[PDB]
Amino acid sequence: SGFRKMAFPSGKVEGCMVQVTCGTTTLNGLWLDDVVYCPRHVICTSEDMLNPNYEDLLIRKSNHNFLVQAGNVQLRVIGHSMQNCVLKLKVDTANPKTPKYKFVRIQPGQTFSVLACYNGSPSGVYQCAMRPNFTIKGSFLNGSCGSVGFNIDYDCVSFCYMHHMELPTGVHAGTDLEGNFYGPFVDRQTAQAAGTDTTITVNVLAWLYAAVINGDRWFLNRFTTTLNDFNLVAMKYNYEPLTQDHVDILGPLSAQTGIAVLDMCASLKELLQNGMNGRTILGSALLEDEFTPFDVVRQCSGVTFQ
Amino acid sequence: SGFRKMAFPSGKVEGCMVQVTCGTTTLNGLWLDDVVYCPRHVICTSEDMLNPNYEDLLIRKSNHNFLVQAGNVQLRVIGHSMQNCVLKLKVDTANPKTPKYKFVRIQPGQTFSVLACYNGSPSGVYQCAMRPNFTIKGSFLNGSCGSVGFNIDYDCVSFCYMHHMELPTGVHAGTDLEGNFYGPFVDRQTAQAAGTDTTITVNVLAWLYAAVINGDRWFLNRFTTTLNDFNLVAMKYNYEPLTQDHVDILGPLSAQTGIAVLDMCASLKELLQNGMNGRTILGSALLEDEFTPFDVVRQCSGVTFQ
Ligand SMILES: *[C@H](F)C(=O)N(C[C@@H]1CCNC1=O)NC(=O)[C@H](CC(C)C)NC(=O)c1cc2c(F)cccc2[nH]1
Ligand SMILES: *[C@H](F)C(=O)N(C[C@@H]1CCNC1=O)NC(=O)[C@H](CC(C)C)NC(=O)c1cc2c(F)cccc2[nH]1
Ligand SMILES: [Cl-]
Ligand SMILES: [Cl-]
Ligand code: NI
Ligand code: NI
Numbered sequence: 365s366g367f368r369k370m371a372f373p374s375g376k377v378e379g380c381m382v383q384v385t386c387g388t389t390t391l392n393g394l395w396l397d398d399v400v401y402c403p404r405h406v407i408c409t410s411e412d413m414l415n416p417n418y419e420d421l422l423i424r425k426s427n428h429n430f431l432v433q434a435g436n437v438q439l440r441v442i443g444h445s446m447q448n449c450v451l452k453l454k455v456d457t458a459n460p461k462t463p464k465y466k467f468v469r470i471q472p473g474q475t476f477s478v479l480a481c482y483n484g485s486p487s488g489v490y491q492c493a494m495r496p497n498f499t500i501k502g503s504f505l506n507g508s509c510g511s512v513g514f515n516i517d518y519d520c521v522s523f524c525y526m527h528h529m530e531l532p533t534g535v536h537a538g539t540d541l542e543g544n545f546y547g548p549f550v551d552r553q554t555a556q557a558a559g560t561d562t563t564i565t566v567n568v569l570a571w572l573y574a575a576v577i578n579g580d581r582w583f584l585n586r587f588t589t590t591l592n593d594f595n596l597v598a599m600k601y602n603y604e605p606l607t608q609d610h611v612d613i614l615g616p617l618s619a620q621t622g623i624a625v626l627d628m629c630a631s632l633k634e635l636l637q638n639g640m641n642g643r644t645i646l647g648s649a650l651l652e653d654e655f656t657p658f659d660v661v662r663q664c665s666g667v668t669f670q
Numbered sequence: 671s672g673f674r675k676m677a678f679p680s681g682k683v684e685g686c687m688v689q690v691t692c693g694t695t696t697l698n699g700l701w702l703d704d705v706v707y708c709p710r711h712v713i714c715t716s717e718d719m720l721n722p723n724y725e726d727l728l729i730r731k732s733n734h735n736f737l738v739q740a741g742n743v744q745l746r747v748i749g750h751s752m753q754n755c756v757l758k759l760k761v762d763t764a765n766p767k768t769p770k771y772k773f774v775r776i777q778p779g780q781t782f783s784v785l786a787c788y789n790g791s792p793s794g795v796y797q798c799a800m801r802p803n804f805t806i807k808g809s810f811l812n813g814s815c816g817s818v819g820f821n822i823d824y825d826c827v828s829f830c831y832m833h834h835m836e837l838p839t840g841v842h843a844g845t846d847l848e849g850n851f852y853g854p855f856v857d858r859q860t861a862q863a864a865g866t867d868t869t870i871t872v873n874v875l876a877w878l879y880a881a882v883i884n885g886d887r888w889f890l891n892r893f894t895t896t897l898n899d900f901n902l903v904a905m906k907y908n909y910e911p912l913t914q915d916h917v918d919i920l921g922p923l924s925a926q927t928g929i930a931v932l933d934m935c936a937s938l939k940e941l942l943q944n945g946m947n948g949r950t951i952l953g954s955a956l957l958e959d960e961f962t963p964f965d966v967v968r969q970c971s972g973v974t975f976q
């Protein structure tokens with residue numbers, strides 16, 4: 365019982381975090397085998413980031429210019445190469461703490477844990493969703509660049525995010541570990557605007573199923589709705605349209621609780637139209653959209669990681 | 671920018687989790703140096719658990735009765751003793767991954783990270799506060815017994831909680847690492863009521879400072895208040911009394927934002943009297959009370975752990 369914003373255990377990722385310094389710029393890198401992955405931003409001076417020619421700037425950089433520190437040990441850089449917005453520093457030592465890992469590009473509406481780091485040391489861990497507008501609502505300060513987002517499945521770390529940018533609205537933007545941004549963002553010292561965001565309907569439904577699993581059932585009503593009638597309400601409240609693919613993904617939670625997906629949609633319609641009337645769901649006064657169906661099953665079934 | 675429920679990185683604690691089995695009962699243990707700490711519940715069979723005489727049950731146990739597994743390695747138990755509600759199993763091997771550590775008993779309002787575990791393997795990490803009623807709002811399933819709660823200062827892990835019980839309202843009770851329960855609770859199979867809970871006033875004020883640090887300051891009014899006049903209002907909304915110690919603990923945040931503690935108290939007094947009127951603070955429609963003043967500084971200044 366209980367339902368919390370639950371992060372993956374961070375130890376497998378902690379063992380990969382290093383400090384990268386080039387000239388006056390220090391940020392985080394990810395050390396996997398004999399490669400350190402970091403934001404290519406690290407090579408730039410102030411006047412470089414005007415409209416930086418990374419091909420031209422990197423040609424001028426020595427392996428010797430990169431200072432890479434794994435705790436109290438300097439790692440020697442023996443080669444460098446750029447992949448999109450990520451710099452790959454080849455080092456002379458393979459990280460003995462490298463976990464089984466993959467690089468994955470996640471979809472909007474999926475979640476991941478962030479290990480927020482400064483000077484290659486961890487500050488903390490929290491859960492994030494990739495928003496429909498390809499931002500995340502992170503917690504990041506100066507020097508957080510190169511902090512990563514990840515999921516774990518059994519023993520395998522799937523890295524999905526490397527932190528680069530804060531927008532003026534105070535939300536965050538970054539890349540996958542192939543250095544391709546999520547969304548229409550660039551790695552520049554500029555004020556950049558995100559598209560309009562939307563509420564992740566399938567996740568709100570997942571969280572209402574979590575509430576039912578945890579015995580918070582007051583919002584359940586006797587009403588049912590069609591998918592079309594529900595979507596006419598979704599649109600008005602800036603919720604994403606619920607597809608049959610989403611209904612299919614909620615199958616397992618519907619089967620666990622005995623509440624048909626379109627019956628839960630009727631309860632969500634009532635909450636959108638009428639509000640909560642002073643009540644809370646899983647301790648929240650708002651409808652939560654940063655838990656996936658899989659996040660709910662993970663937490664409610666006690667899935668562990670080896 | 672941003673403000674998240676942020677846990678400590680869990681790696682140092684992950685390296686201490688083991689499985690303890692006595693007969694048919696399996697739960698989690700904490701392996702520090704050559705001692706494994708676990709709930710004494712592990713020595714109960716069926717129809718021991720409703721009114722166990724733990725002293726009598728432990729007399730009948732041999733060292734070999736305790737199966738302790740650290741991953742796929744079995745640890746040899748060479749002694750056992752009971753301290754309050756915790757079992758101390760002396761093993762013939764010191765844990766090479768033992769961090770610098772202390773055992774501390776925390777006060778209501780203090781927060782900590784929980785590494786929820788099953789069969790000695792971590793499921794996830796989240797933040798909890800010790801509630802005024804000496805419960806915690808965790809996320810725990812069957813077999814979570816012996817999961818621990820902790821803080822990190824620099825490199826020192828302060829363990830403050832070991833999980834034992836779920837209460838009827840779906841909240842949680844457990845002990846310090848000396849085996850003394852927080853609150854009136856006992857390690858027995860019986861429904862045990864938590865006291866009516868209250869709001870942690872010093873933490874709400876800390877979170878209002880986090881809001882101001884993040885440029886969310888709509889709720890700041892042009893008034894001040896005395897500590898007396900504030901408490902007269904607090905006590906009508908099920909808030910904890912604010913003390914001068916609370917005021918001084920909030921001093922650094924007051925210094926950072928230029929808002930005197932008593933001026934912030936006047937803004938909180940107006941939020942209690944008038945409500946939030948559909949407005950949000952740091953993305954919440956409720957006043958959040960599970961961040962301490964140190965939690966806000968750690969997160970907003972990027973404090974790291976080595
Ligand atoms: C890089 F080292 C780093 O840590 N960050 C993290 C930002 C800092 C504050 N909170 C964060 O998440 N990245 C940067 O500082 C970005 C560097 C670029 C070149 C990748 N810059 C920005 O995020 C940025 C610049 C800028 C601006 F010029 C105007 C408005 C907003 C803005 N954001
Ligand atoms: C012990 F191994 C363990 O994992 N748990 C964790 C509980 C399980 C469900 N969620 C949790 O947090 N502890 C127990 O199962 C407790 C064992 C005792 C004997 C120490 N029992 C309870 O937590 C319990 C028993 C009980 C009851 F009989 C009525 C109402 C509530 C209640 N909780
Ligand atoms: Cl006792
Ligand atoms: Cl106001
Ligand atoms: Ni439960
Ligand atoms: Ni040199």
Ligand code: NI
Nearest residue numbers: 504505671672
């Ligand atoms: Ni900021």
Ligand code: NI
Nearest residue numbers: 728729731732
């Ligand atoms: Ni004995």
Ligand code: NI
Nearest residue numbers: 734735736737
């Ligand atoms: Ni044997």
